[PDB]
Design an enzyme around this catalytic site. Sequence first.
Site, PDB file in Angstrom:
ATOM      1  N   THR A   1       0.864  -1.178   0.000  1.00  0.00           N
ATOM      2  CA  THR A   1       0.000   0.000   0.000  1.00  0.00           C
ATOM      3  C   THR A   1       0.887   1.209   0.000  1.00  0.00           C
ATOM      4  OG1 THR A   1      -1.763   1.097   1.347  1.00  0.00           O
ATOM      5  CG2 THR A   1      -0.257  -0.391   2.481  1.00  0.00           C
ATOM      6  N   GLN A   2       0.650   2.100  -1.036  1.00  0.00           N
ATOM      7  CA  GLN A   2       1.618   3.150  -1.439  1.00  0.00           C
ATOM      8  C   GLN A   2       0.894   4.386  -1.961  1.00  0.00           C
ATOM      9  OE1 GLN A   2       0.990   3.059  -4.901  1.00  0.00           O
ATOM     10  NE2 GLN A   2      -0.095   1.071  -4.431  1.00  0.00           N
TER      11      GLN A   2
END
Lengths: 246, 213, 238, 245, 233, 201, 216, 249, 196
Positions: free
Chosen positions: G1-2
């Site tokens: 998750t970015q």
Amino acid sequence: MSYDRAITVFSPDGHLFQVEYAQEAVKKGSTAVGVRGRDIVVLGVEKKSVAKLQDERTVRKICALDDNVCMAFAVVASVSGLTADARIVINRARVECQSHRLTVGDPVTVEYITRYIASLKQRYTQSNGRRPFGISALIVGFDFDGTPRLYQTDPSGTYHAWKANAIGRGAKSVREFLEKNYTDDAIETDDLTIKLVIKALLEVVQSGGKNIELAVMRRDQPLKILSPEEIEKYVAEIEKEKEENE
Amino acid sequence: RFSPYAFNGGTVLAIAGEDFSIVASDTRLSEGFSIHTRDSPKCYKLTDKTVIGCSGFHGDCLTLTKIIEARLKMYKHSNNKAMTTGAIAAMLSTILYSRRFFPYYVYNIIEGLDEEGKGAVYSFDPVGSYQRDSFKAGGSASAMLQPLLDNQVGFKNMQNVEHVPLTLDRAMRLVKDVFISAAERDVYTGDALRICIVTKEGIREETVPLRKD
Amino acid sequence: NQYDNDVTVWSPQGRIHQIEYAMEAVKQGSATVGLKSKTHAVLVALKRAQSELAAHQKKILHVDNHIGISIAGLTADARLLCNFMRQECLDSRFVFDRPLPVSRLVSLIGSKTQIPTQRYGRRPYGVGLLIAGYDDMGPHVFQTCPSANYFDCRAMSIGARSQSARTYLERHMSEFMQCNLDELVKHGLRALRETLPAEQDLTTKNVSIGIVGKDLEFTIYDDDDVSPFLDGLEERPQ
Amino acid sequence: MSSIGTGYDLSASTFSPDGRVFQVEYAMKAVENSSTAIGIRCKDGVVFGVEKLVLSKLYEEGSNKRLFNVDRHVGMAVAGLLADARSLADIAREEASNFRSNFGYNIPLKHLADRVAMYVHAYTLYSAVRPFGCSFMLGSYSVNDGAQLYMIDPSGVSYGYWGCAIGKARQAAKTEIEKLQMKEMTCRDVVKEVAKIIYIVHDEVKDKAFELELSWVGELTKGRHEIVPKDVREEAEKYAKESLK
Amino acid sequence: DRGVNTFSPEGRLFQVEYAIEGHKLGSTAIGIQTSEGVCLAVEKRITSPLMEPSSIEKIVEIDAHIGCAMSGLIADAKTLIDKARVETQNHWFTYNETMTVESVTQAVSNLALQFGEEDADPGAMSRPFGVALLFGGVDEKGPQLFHMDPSGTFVQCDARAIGSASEGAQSSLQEVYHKSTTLKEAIKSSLIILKQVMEEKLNATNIELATVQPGQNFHMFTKEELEEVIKDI
Amino acid sequence: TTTLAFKFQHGVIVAADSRATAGPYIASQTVKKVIEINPYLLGTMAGGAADCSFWERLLARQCRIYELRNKERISVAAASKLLANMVYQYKGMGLSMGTMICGWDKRGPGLYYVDSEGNRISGTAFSVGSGSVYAFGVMDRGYSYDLQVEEAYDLARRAIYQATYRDAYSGGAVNLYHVREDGWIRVSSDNVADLHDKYTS
Amino acid sequence: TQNPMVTGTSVLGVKFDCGVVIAADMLGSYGSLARFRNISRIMRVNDSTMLGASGDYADFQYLKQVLGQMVIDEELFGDGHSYSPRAIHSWLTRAMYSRRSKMNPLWNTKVIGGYAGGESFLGYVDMLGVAYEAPSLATGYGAYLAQPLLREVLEKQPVLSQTEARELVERCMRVLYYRDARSYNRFQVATVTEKGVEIEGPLSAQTNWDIAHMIS
Amino acid sequence: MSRRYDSRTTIFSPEGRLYQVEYAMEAIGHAGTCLGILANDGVLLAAERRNIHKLLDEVFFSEKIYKLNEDMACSVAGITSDANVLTNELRLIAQRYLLQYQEPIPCEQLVTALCDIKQAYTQFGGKRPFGVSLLYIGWDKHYGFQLYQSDPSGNYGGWKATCIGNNSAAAVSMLKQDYKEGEMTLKSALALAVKVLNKTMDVSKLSAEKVEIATLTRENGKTVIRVLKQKEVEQLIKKHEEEEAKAER
Amino acid sequence: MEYLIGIQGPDYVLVASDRVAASNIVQMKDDHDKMFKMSEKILLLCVGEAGDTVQFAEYIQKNVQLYKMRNGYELSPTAAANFTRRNLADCLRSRTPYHVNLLLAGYDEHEGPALYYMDYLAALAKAPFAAHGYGAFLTLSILDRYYTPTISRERAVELLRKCLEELQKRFILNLPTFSVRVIDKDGIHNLENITF
């Protein structure tokens, strides 16, 4: 340029020109015989092309590629005693053999190097500009198993094992001759194994047994080249028995 | 295999149970990154061909990436044979992909469930690292551990008894798949939206939605 | 003769003979019918054989389970394209993830077949291929011939004595779109019977049938799996 | 003899005593075997008119490939060997593809024609691959230099034209174009004009039975190369029929 | 300087017509398909009993469970087998089931016509394979034997015999074998047919027998093992 | 001499063992994990540590041992197979490793045993163990050791190791997989539970 | 998750799919960090005569994508006379590119929404920075996906597709909320619609204001 | 044959036996004699340079006898143009050997490295065969002073007296005949070298413009190789000259 | 610490060499009964000492390479040459991501330069000298050779010196007395000497 001239043309013969032609060279210059024995598989050569001022160490007509596989050859072509063609084939086949040891251990089997060498000439038939080597080598050796093998390769690159096989000075002639001498007794006894080699060589005897060089090779052990002096001991006695059959 | 940045920590679990003449495979259709849901559509079950249905789970991108690989091999073998192949082929092709990413492996778990060309219905687990095994029942993902206790007590029965002390019946397993999905919603914070269960006969898929939130 | 030993030898017509000589192999090779409706694409093939102790040669090949081909000509050149095409399909799902359009592939092969007809001495591929496919757009019956020219056609027949099949396709231009999976197959048999003598008709064992369309994926039918399709025996004139 | 059909074309590494190799002259003959492709240039686009030779009426669109889409403002109408027609389409197109990525703008035709022409001549030099032997036109509407029409023949010569026709009736057709006007007038008036030239030139010792295909690349289609609509095609054709008779 | 390929006016490659004639010169290969295995029988082409029947490359392994027998030009065959061999063992590693005998057959037929040199390619051949192959192996649907020939004609076979007389080799197959019958008899039929195309009468020395079964898989025979299958002439 | 995967040499047979679950992590991937696998049919192996690490080397090995066998048409030395595995694991070292194999197969002298390590070693030794926790394992088996082990005696040995190792250790889990190789034909001996073996012994 | 720290961002790309059209609103503002350098900015591009593409998040990563999709489209139309490319192949191949560039840890996200019809079907595809393709009823990516999309989801929840009028009221509601809640953007939107002739969407203009909660 | 199937080395012989090599051997005979004689404190090489003309710039004394290494020297008989690539190649190999082995390079090892390049050119790569026979002279501590002969084809042999060039057949037999073994010294092998060189060659005079003479002599256990300058050469010629003169009328 | 123990005592012609068998990984002896002393030939023996992986990998490769040289020249590889040859090999290998460093000893009799024994450092520094040790033991083994002999005393007394050095191996470093592989290498080949 002409269609016949070109390297590509499969010819009415039904086989590629340069592969066919290399096969018609396996008689003349030098002679290599190898017979199978329990304790030693032995190859012998006649004619190293030595004037006896020429180094015999430089010319190898019997070279050990592995530590349990060795080969002796002969061939036909332009310019006598021709070290070069045979010599490239020794260099690539011997390195490959040492590289095989490094990858997958212990002395490499007789049959594997022979498979590699037959395929080596074959791949060339596809490859650009390249004709196959006209050489037949009598691959003589013992397996890691210790199962004696005698193998022979041909110029197209089809190989077969034999008990005993002879090439050069007319391949067909020396093969036929060797078949009268071979017996199941000959393979069991250590004295007879050497004499069987020498017995095929002698029908084109030249200059003593000092001209003729033999090696015995054992199960995992390096090539031992018997003295040029020892060979002479067998020839004097045998040569008389030889005259009678032909 | 880790995802704080490099890969997607997009949560989601699929569970598949093989009986011996069906596979029920149940997964959520929520695609999310972290605790947040991105968007409510897109089922994480995807059918490679028609005769096989794979469930890929963990990051969604990783899920799209795995199916492609399983799909390109699944057709190739079918073409060659001139007859179809299924469950067994998906696991075995994963072995090849896992070798492909030896140095850093893809954090997705694909479980191909359908019927194999060797016979009898199979839901097989490869994991993205390497390794293959057949399972009795298995639920796999980042919440893998949560299905496992249900399958371990019923199916394996290693000093345990449950409904029957044998690998559980078709009627029970389908109920068990529905059951785990409700429980997961409370416990875990990534499972959301609706749960879609696909039941595969080995040749065809049927789909049923159930809302839970 | 002389033009085709090389390729760089150009003719006094201005057209290379290597391509023309390559077309004549297609005349030696098996008769094929390829027809489309507008929901389906049908490949009706004549199988030839070397032994009848051996199973008759499958002339519907799986490229993918959505496009398939039927070959007429040199078999070695066919198989070479078969594999080439097969990999392209695999590539297309791998990257794009969808069923490959027939239209993207005929053009791609058409680019590739031109290259060795231009390479010095090299062949143009002495094989004509009929690709029957159902993708997302609907059915396509494509011709690649030894010339890199391709045709988009509704129904055509390539191979030995296929000309006789082509004439019956022209009468029944109207019927194709209109026809069902069953009906379109009976016309392929009608077209296929023309190829063969006025002494004889089709048997189950020399016919191979390949069906892809809306109703079902690409399945190839062999030696006696052709039968439910097969029934329908129409006129063969003298 | 100005050409020998065996000797000095055994390899593509040859020249001839006049100065031009015979293989290239044969390559002009290859284009003669096929029908005519005309393309007349406006200042609001180019309009092509090619007659497509037919053998069947089971043919549908994307058959023979007389019109290719080189770009989203570059059109191509071709004439000659259809086999050869596909590679020339690739050569122009690949040059276009690299160009679009890097430069980031619509291609000027003045650059494309010379750039491609180099490539067409480059096969002729090599004996790795034989000369080309189809002839093509490039017609473009851009804001880069306006509407421009070039013709590149299999030798690798690129020239400007307001009206070019390549075929076996190229000489007879080009003269015919010069008598009509189309130089300053819109693509909509022109389409009608491209059709009629094809019917009037149309001989029975240079061509065979054909179905008409015409193509846009101009302001009406908003740059892009599309085939003319069937309805429009049939009005352009209806004038073409009337004009012969 | 020159091309590679030359089409004859008949409409077919000159080199491919020559390649058929190529087959007539060599060894013979018979394969007989039973639902209990595929056996391949081939002669080495003898001239001396000193030539071992123990280990001779005429029947070679494509895979652990696929054996391939060659006829025509023997030498050239070992290169075709090597290319098939690399594809087949990668597929075997991945699948751990079976590598379709049919795919392998399709792959080799690509090598038959591909050849270019003289300003085309250094990676492609200067010759056509004048090899015809019988790939006999065991697969998940069942034991399958496929026939390939220099023209590239891949066909599925229940039973096929190919040899130095193609007409001869098959005609003997008609007499002796019938599709369905025991495993033991399929070997029996291979040997009778093999003797017929061959000059000389059958012996242990002249042939090599290798059976690929789903039950035993590929076995390369040595001299003691050869005497057993010889019993049934 | 590491992890709950062991092989030790003797001339009568070789016993090759691995658990179901030797604790390659902290958890099971599914309900049942297998480690004990032979994609060959004449060779036996050990291998522990990580999940990935034993599966890769042995699948890699299957290809490599057939490829030589295929061409030459007689089976290659046990040493040739083990050196092949050894070169390959060395490449694999440092990305996920603690794996090593213990090779048994028929060679020229007779039945042969070579232990190839993750380092790049090919050595013969009395006993090796593949992975990380046979370091705590060594003694009990080490008290009752001899060079020659009978068929009967080898089974009594492995059975007990796991029973004491439940008491001392815990990484031992689920099932004990025993495989006996005569020299070139392995048979599956007993698939006895680790818990069950605690109860008897 | 970015989510990389974006420099030059387009914050929002609105999208709702209707029966033969799509209505898209695209943010006019181009924030280059805190400073809003350029408003005029339409982030929706014309690839071809039946396709359009609209993206939000980094604008640089967008301009690199528009030429690349231009060369992919140019290869595909050549094969026909007027063939146009379907949404799914171009969007999915780009998905594989972003999954690879995400793994490379220094990179910048962009998330695009493609509308095309090249099949027998009107396709609405997305390639994301994370990557995936899906269908959506109503869509918004990036900063829309985080905060308005949830408002959209709320709506979508009992009434699967909204009406025309209701989507307009939401749009108007939405622009207020973004200026108020997110930073970089402005109220200013361009209304862009794609149809079978090309993409039409004139220059971004000001629309309803309310950064007042003094009134709340 | 009735026609060669050679005209390239990317196509091959109509017998598979290479004619081009026999023409190459004839090529050494066209070019001037090269001879090597063995000594018991050195080895020397004597070669006939291409230049016979009076006008010589004489910056080089090495124009057929090139000193390669700090242990070995070689000579050319054949085309001069061919040596230039070869000589620079030989320098690379010769120093390459030292880097790994750091031993007084044996003559057999240097020659085998070179033979690899010559055999490949004849087989493929489309490069024309060589037309030079090179004589390598060197010292190793394991057999002594050695002389080797290399052929265009890649064919090699260790000698201790060998001659090629200006009819090979005559020349090798003659060089042998006059050679003695274990009776030698460097000055007398050198005086003799001119004498034999004179007989094979048509000239009965011979000068340092016509001829170039090199020594390889081992001093203080290390091999110093020099190709000699013209005044030094002349002195060896004049030594021979008195004898040659008596033969003449 | 550098590596486990080695002690090597050259006599004046003969060289007597010992290394532990103990090739230990994790905390157990994996091997404890094999020689990592390599026969690269019969006239030359090389004995490689270092880490577990670099020992077997570098020498097995060297061995196959040694044999190739033998065929080519048709004389045993030269001793002087072998001493410089091993220095180029270990420097080239040294950069590799898997670390190669060898504390080597070449023993040969050649008919050329003569006998050679080579001390070789862990900094890939080549020197011939008489008295060598392996590990941090090189300092421990070189030191007792300087005082107690002038490094020309009998092999028998040298063995007694070796027994005393091995007693250090129990004290300063970790290795147990259990097994050491002992070989004396002279002109004929290698001789197996008693284990400790």
